[PDB]
Known about the structure:
The structure is cut from a larger assembly and holds two copies of chain A. Helices cover 54% and strands 0% of the residues of chain A. The radius of gyration of chain A is 21 Å and the shape is rod-shaped. Chain A contains two helices and no strands. The N and C termini of chain A lie far apart (64 Å). Chains A and B meet through loops of A and loops of B. The PDB classes it as viral protein/immune system. The entry lists the keywords viral protein, VIRAL PROTEIN-IMMUNE SYSTEM complex. SARS-CoV-2 BA.2 variant spike protein in complex with Fab BD55-5840.
Amino acid sequence: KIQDSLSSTPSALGKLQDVVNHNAQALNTLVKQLSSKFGAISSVLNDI
Amino acid sequence: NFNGLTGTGVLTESNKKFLPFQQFGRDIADTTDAVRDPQTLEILDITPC
């Protein structure tokens, strides 16, 4: 019945999924922060 | 260099469908991704080194 329980319930492996989910949005925010002007004329060094 | 868009990278053929009133393309960085030639009317693609 272990195989049936694993194949039926789709949220049994939730602890392992959070570990890999928390390590993607961190990089996503770290790369999205590059579009902030930080109180400057522009966010592009070449333009400045 | 395209009308004051200094940069560095390779230029390659692109198949993006720009609109007549559109000229530039962007990924999510506020950084240029696709540019259109001034003299000829064809869409280029920019990829870093």
